[PDB]
Motif scaffolding. Structure first.
Motif, PDB file in Angstrom:
ATOM      1  N   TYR A 182      15.855  -5.233 -12.149  1.00  2.45           N
ATOM      2  CA  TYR A 182      16.217  -4.707 -10.838  1.00  2.45           C
ATOM      3  C   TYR A 182      15.438  -3.506 -10.319  1.00  2.45           C
ATOM      4  O   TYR A 182      15.071  -2.611 -11.073  1.00  2.45           O
ATOM      5  N   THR A 183      15.203  -3.508  -9.012  1.00  2.00           N
ATOM      6  CA  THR A 183      14.503  -2.415  -8.345  1.00  2.00           C
ATOM      7  C   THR A 183      15.448  -1.897  -7.255  1.00  2.00           C
ATOM      8  O   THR A 183      16.124  -2.680  -6.578  1.00  2.00           O
ATOM      9  N   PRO A 184      15.505  -0.572  -7.060  1.00  2.00           N
ATOM     10  CA  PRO A 184      16.398  -0.019  -6.034  1.00  2.00           C
ATOM     11  C   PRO A 184      16.009  -0.376  -4.612  1.00  2.00           C
ATOM     12  O   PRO A 184      14.829  -0.502  -4.302  1.00  2.00           O
ATOM     13  N   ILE A 185      17.002  -0.578  -3.752  1.00  2.00           N
ATOM     14  CA  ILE A 185      16.689  -0.828  -2.360  1.00  2.00           C
ATOM     15  C   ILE A 185      16.565   0.634  -1.882  1.00  2.00           C
ATOM     16  O   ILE A 185      17.520   1.405  -1.964  1.00  2.00           O
ATOM     17  N   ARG A 186      15.379   1.028  -1.433  1.00  2.00           N
ATOM     18  CA  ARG A 186      15.164   2.416  -1.019  1.00  2.00           C
ATOM     19  C   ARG A 186      16.055   2.877   0.126  1.00  2.00           C
ATOM     20  O   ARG A 186      16.629   3.968   0.081  1.00  2.00           O
ATOM     21  N   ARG A 187      16.168   2.036   1.143  1.00  2.00           N
ATOM     22  CA  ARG A 187      16.971   2.343   2.324  1.00  2.00           C
ATOM     23  C   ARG A 187      17.455   1.023   2.913  1.00  2.00           C
ATOM     24  O   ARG A 187      16.719   0.035   2.939  1.00  2.00           O
ATOM     25  N   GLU A 188      18.690   1.012   3.393  1.00  2.00           N
ATOM     26  CA  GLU A 188      19.279  -0.187   3.960  1.00  2.00           C
ATOM     27  C   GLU A 188      18.956  -0.447   5.426  1.00  2.00           C
ATOM     28  O   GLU A 188      19.714  -0.068   6.311  1.00  2.00           O
ATOM     29  N   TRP A 189      17.809  -1.067   5.676  1.00  2.00           N
ATOM     30  CA  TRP A 189      17.408  -1.469   7.025  1.00  2.00           C
ATOM     31  C   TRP A 189      16.700  -2.774   6.693  1.00  2.00           C
ATOM     32  O   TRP A 189      17.327  -3.829   6.779  1.00  2.00           O
ATOM     33  N   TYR A 190      15.425  -2.729   6.302  1.00  2.00           N
ATOM     34  CA  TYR A 190      14.749  -3.953   5.833  1.00  2.00           C
ATOM     35  C   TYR A 190      15.164  -3.920   4.350  1.00  2.00           C
ATOM     36  O   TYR A 190      15.871  -2.996   3.939  1.00  2.00           O
ATOM     37  N   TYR A 191      14.774  -4.909   3.545  1.00  2.00           N
ATOM     38  CA  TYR A 191      15.089  -4.819   2.118  1.00  2.00           C
ATOM     39  C   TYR A 191      13.854  -4.102   1.598  1.00  2.00           C
ATOM     40  O   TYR A 191      12.891  -4.725   1.138  1.00  2.00           O
ATOM     41  N   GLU A 192      13.883  -2.776   1.721  1.00  4.34           N
ATOM     42  CA  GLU A 192      12.767  -1.923   1.327  1.00  4.34           C
ATOM     43  C   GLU A 192      12.743  -1.527  -0.142  1.00  4.34           C
ATOM     44  O   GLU A 192      13.736  -1.076  -0.690  1.00  4.34           O
ATOM     45  N   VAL A 193      11.584  -1.688  -0.764  1.00  4.23           N
ATOM     46  CA  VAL A 193      11.422  -1.348  -2.167  1.00  4.23           C
ATOM     47  C   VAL A 193      10.170  -0.474  -2.347  1.00  4.23           C
ATOM     48  O   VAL A 193       9.424  -0.234  -1.397  1.00  4.23           O
ATOM     49  N   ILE A 194       9.944   0.000  -3.566  1.00  2.00           N
ATOM     50  CA  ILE A 194       8.783   0.831  -3.844  1.00  2.00           C
ATOM     51  C   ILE A 194       7.892   0.250  -4.933  1.00  2.00           C
ATOM     52  O   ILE A 194       8.341   0.016  -6.055  1.00  2.00           O
ATOM     53  N   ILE A 195       6.630   0.014  -4.584  1.00  2.00           N
ATOM     54  CA  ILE A 195       5.640  -0.515  -5.510  1.00  2.00           C
ATOM     55  C   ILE A 195       4.977   0.716  -6.139  1.00  2.00           C
ATOM     56  O   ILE A 195       4.469   1.587  -5.425  1.00  2.00           O
ATOM     57  N   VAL A 196       4.983   0.798  -7.465  1.00  2.00           N
ATOM     58  CA  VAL A 196       4.418   1.960  -8.138  1.00  2.00           C
ATOM     59  C   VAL A 196       3.061   1.740  -8.800  1.00  2.00           C
ATOM     60  O   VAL A 196       2.426   2.692  -9.238  1.00  2.00           O
ATOM     61  N   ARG A 197       2.607   0.492  -8.862  1.00  2.00           N
ATOM     62  CA  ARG A 197       1.322   0.198  -9.471  1.00  2.00           C
ATOM     63  C   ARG A 197       0.903  -1.237  -9.172  1.00  2.00           C
ATOM     64  O   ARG A 197       1.745  -2.120  -8.986  1.00  2.00           O
ATOM     65  N   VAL A 198      -0.404  -1.462  -9.108  1.00  2.85           N
ATOM     66  CA  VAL A 198      -0.920  -2.799  -8.855  1.00  2.85           C
ATOM     67  C   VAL A 198      -2.097  -3.052  -9.766  1.00  2.85           C
ATOM     68  O   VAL A 198      -2.981  -2.206  -9.884  1.00  2.85           O
ATOM     69  N   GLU A 199      -2.099  -4.208 -10.427  1.00  3.86           N
ATOM     70  CA  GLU A 199      -3.204  -4.572 -11.310  1.00  3.86           C
ATOM     71  C   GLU A 199      -3.698  -5.969 -10.985  1.00  3.86           C
ATOM     72  O   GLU A 199      -2.917  -6.840 -10.607  1.00  3.86           O
ATOM     73  N   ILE A 200      -5.001  -6.172 -11.135  1.00  3.75           N
ATOM     74  CA  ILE A 200      -5.611  -7.477 -10.890  1.00  3.75           C
ATOM     75  C   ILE A 200      -6.295  -7.837 -12.200  1.00  3.75           C
ATOM     76  O   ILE A 200      -7.153  -7.097 -12.677  1.00  3.75           O
ATOM     77  N   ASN A 201      -5.888  -8.961 -12.788  1.00  5.78           N
ATOM     78  CA  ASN A 201      -6.409  -9.390 -14.079  1.00  5.78           C
ATOM     79  C   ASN A 201      -6.332  -8.231 -15.076  1.00  5.78           C
ATOM     80  O   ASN A 201      -7.271  -7.982 -15.830  1.00  5.78           O
ATOM     81  N   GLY A 202      -5.209  -7.514 -15.047  1.00  2.47           N
ATOM     82  CA  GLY A 202      -4.997  -6.399 -15.957  1.00  2.47           C
ATOM     83  C   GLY A 202      -5.803  -5.144 -15.677  1.00  2.47           C
ATOM     84  O   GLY A 202      -5.895  -4.265 -16.535  1.00  2.47           O
ATOM     85  N   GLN A 203      -6.380  -5.055 -14.481  1.00  5.44           N
ATOM     86  CA  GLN A 203      -7.195  -3.903 -14.086  1.00  5.44           C
ATOM     87  C   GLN A 203      -6.495  -3.118 -12.966  1.00  5.44           C
ATOM     88  O   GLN A 203      -6.263  -3.647 -11.881  1.00  5.44           O
ATOM     89  N   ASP A 204      -6.164  -1.859 -13.235  1.00  6.77           N
ATOM     90  CA  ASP A 204      -5.489  -1.010 -12.258  1.00  6.77           C
ATOM     91  C   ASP A 204      -6.364  -0.800 -11.026  1.00  6.77           C
ATOM     92  O   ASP A 204      -7.536  -0.435 -11.146  1.00  6.77           O
ATOM     93  N   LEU A 205      -5.800  -1.027  -9.843  1.00  6.46           N
ATOM     94  CA  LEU A 205      -6.552  -0.837  -8.609  1.00  6.46           C
ATOM     95  C   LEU A 205      -6.933   0.633  -8.411  1.00  6.46           C
ATOM     96  O   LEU A 205      -7.761   0.953  -7.567  1.00  6.46           O
ATOM     97  N   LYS A 206      -6.323   1.528  -9.181  1.00  4.74           N
ATOM     98  CA  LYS A 206      -6.640   2.950  -9.073  1.00  4.74           C
ATOM     99  C   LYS A 206      -6.569   3.464  -7.635  1.00  4.74           C
ATOM    100  O   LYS A 206      -7.587   3.813  -7.040  1.00  4.74           O
ATOM    101  N   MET A 207      -5.368   3.498  -7.078  1.00  5.73           N
ATOM    102  CA  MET A 207      -5.170   3.991  -5.725  1.00  5.73           C
ATOM    103  C   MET A 207      -3.926   4.851  -5.742  1.00  5.73           C
ATOM    104  O   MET A 207      -3.094   4.709  -6.634  1.00  5.73           O
ATOM    105  N   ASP A 208      -3.809   5.752  -4.774  1.00  7.79           N
ATOM    106  CA  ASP A 208      -2.626   6.592  -4.667  1.00  7.79           C
ATOM    107  C   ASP A 208      -1.526   5.573  -4.387  1.00  7.79           C
ATOM    108  O   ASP A 208      -1.623   4.811  -3.422  1.00  7.79           O
ATOM    109  N   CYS A 209      -0.494   5.548  -5.221  1.00 12.89           N
ATOM    110  CA  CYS A 209       0.577   4.578  -5.039  1.00 12.89           C
ATOM    111  C   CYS A 209       1.226   4.641  -3.662  1.00 12.89           C
ATOM    112  O   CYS A 209       1.835   3.666  -3.217  1.00 12.89           O
ATOM    113  N   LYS A 210       1.087   5.764  -2.963  1.00 14.64           N
ATOM    114  CA  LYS A 210       1.650   5.840  -1.618  1.00 14.64           C
ATOM    115  C   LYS A 210       0.982   4.787  -0.738  1.00 14.64           C
ATOM    116  O   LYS A 210       1.605   4.237   0.180  1.00 14.64           O
ATOM    117  N   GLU A 211      -0.283   4.491  -1.026  1.00 16.67           N
ATOM    118  CA  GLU A 211      -1.024   3.495  -0.245  1.00 16.67           C
ATOM    119  C   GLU A 211      -0.365   2.118  -0.310  1.00 16.67           C
ATOM    120  O   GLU A 211      -0.423   1.347   0.650  1.00 16.67           O
TER     121      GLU A 211
END
Ligand SMILES: CCCCNC(=O)[C@@H](NC(=O)[C@H](C)C[C@H](O)[C@@H]1CSC/C=C/CSC[C@H](NC(=O)OC(C)(C)C)C(=O)N[C@@H](C)C(=O)N1)C(C)C
Length: 377
Positions: A182-211
């Motif tokens: 489970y992931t928290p619904i950040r705010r009740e309007w859209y079903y908003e969630v927070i992505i904290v990391r992204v990897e492609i073929n096990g390689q971190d995209l290395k970006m500010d997670c805010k992006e």
């Protein structure tokens, strides 16, 4: 008693998933698109080239006019109509009947799809984004207040011409394998969630997670593709290109325009990377990830020619309104919209995607520091 709701969804690839509903007295049957990205319940109420049937208010004795117009714009398509209320039921859903708000669509532009088989839309998100304002109680809110149906639903969307299940009021444990994360619904309007990391073929995209969450990230069953913010979209495409540099694809392909084809059964899946989206978890400094296979973001399309070759379209597009985890992402996963506990759960679906050496997955736990800094303000 969820068994009667299994397989209650149908649809065509890229045309959305719909459930059958009835409105008015006597009951009028209509197929309604299930959309977690909006909060208005609306149905075609006037003739239209793409509508095989529509809502006829004059034939319903329980119909009530609210004498108030409404307009609703979507990422793609829009309509306007008159507000009112009437009795509504879900044949292959909970055995109940409730009075809910209904927008009678009188005019629309690029909303109804030719041959989609649905004539309405059921916005399952919260009142905060309901039109004209948050005073118009959404269908699910009405359902929960007027009946004993628990405050949650789950969606199991299956790819290919497409089917799935919408379990109203609960979780059907036979529809998924492994554990629900489970992931928290950040705010009740859209079903908003927070992505904290992204990897492609096990390689971190290395970006500010805010992006990843600029300016928000939502789960939307009514959107086909995985939509990513410009900066993330660019980094993702670049990485996916390099991974598949073996072959060459038209520049229009990566734009969702042109499509690529291969000899029936020769699609080089192995050259396309898996994508891992890490979501904020339920305990301090904890997250989990969902892994997307190429068979998910490469939506199969009918051969534009008289050939018997497998053609696909890039189902990842650029967004200017934040990340959107659309149907291609939800397919293969069992998704629980646990409104009662303000959280969304993910588990591997029983109708999951299939790859020879790889497999879609939901894995945890992972340690992730400063997850709160990933949220955009
Ligand atoms: C201008 C936007 C103003 C803000 N409006 C919203 O946010 C509204 N909500 C939304 O727009 C949702 C976020 C989106 C909503 O689910 C709407 C539901 S429209 C009815 C859905 C029909 C099923 S086909 C889905 C389509 N597939 C598609 O385009 O495939 C190709 C890309 C290959 C052509 C698609 O993806 N549509 C996205 C784009 C979209 O608009 N979806 C409401 C809250 C008012």
């Amino acid at each position: 008693s969820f068994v009667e709701m299994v397989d209650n969804l149908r649809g065509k690839s890229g045309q959305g998933y719909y459930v059958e509903m009835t409105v008015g007295s006597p009951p009028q049957t209509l197929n309604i698109l299930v959309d977690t990205g909006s909060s208005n319940f609306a149905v075609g109420a006037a003739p239209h080239p793409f509508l095989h049937r529509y809502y006829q208010r004059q034939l319903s004795s329980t119909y009530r006019d609210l004498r108030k117009g409404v307009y609703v714009p979507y990422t793609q398509g829009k309509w306007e109509g008159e507000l009112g209320t009437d009795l509504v039921s879900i044949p292959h859903g909970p055995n109940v009947t409730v009075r809910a708000n209904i927008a009678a669509i009188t005019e629309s532009d690029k909303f109804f799809i030719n041959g989609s088989n649905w004539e309405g839309i059921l916005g399952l998100a919260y009142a905060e984004i309901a039109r004209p304002d948050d005073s118009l109680e959404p269908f699910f809110d009405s359902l929960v207040k007027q009946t004993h149906v628990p405050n949650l639903f789950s969606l199991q969307l299956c790819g290919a011409s497409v089917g799935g299940s919408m379990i109203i009021g609960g979780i059907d444990h036979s529809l998924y394998t492994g554990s629900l994360w489970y992931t928290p619904i950040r705010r009740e309007w859209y079903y908003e969630v927070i992505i904290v990391r992204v990897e492609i073929n096990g390689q971190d995209l290395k970006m500010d997670c805010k992006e990843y969450n600029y300016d928000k990230s939502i789960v939307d069953s009514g959107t086909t593709n995985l939509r990513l913010p410009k900066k993330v979209f660019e980094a993702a495409v670049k990485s996916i290109k390099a991974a598949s540099s073996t072959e060459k694809f038209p520049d229009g392909f990566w734009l969702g325009e042109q499509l690529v084809c291969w000899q029936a059964g020769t699609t080089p899946w192995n050259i396309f990377p898996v994508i891992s989206l890490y979501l904020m978890g339920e305990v301090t400094n904890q997250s989990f990830r969902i892994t997307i296979l190429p068979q998910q973001y490469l939506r199969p399309v009918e051969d534009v020619a008289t050939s018997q070759d497998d053609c696909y379209k890039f189902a990842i597009s650029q967004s200017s309104t934040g990340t959107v985890m659309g149907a291609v992402i939800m397919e293969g996963f069992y998704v629980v919209f646990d409104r009662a506990r303000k959280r969304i759960g993910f588990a591997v679906s029983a109708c999951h995607v299939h790859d020879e050496f790889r497999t879609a997955a939901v894995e945890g736990p992972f340690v992730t520091l400063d997850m709160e800094d990933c949220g955009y303000n």
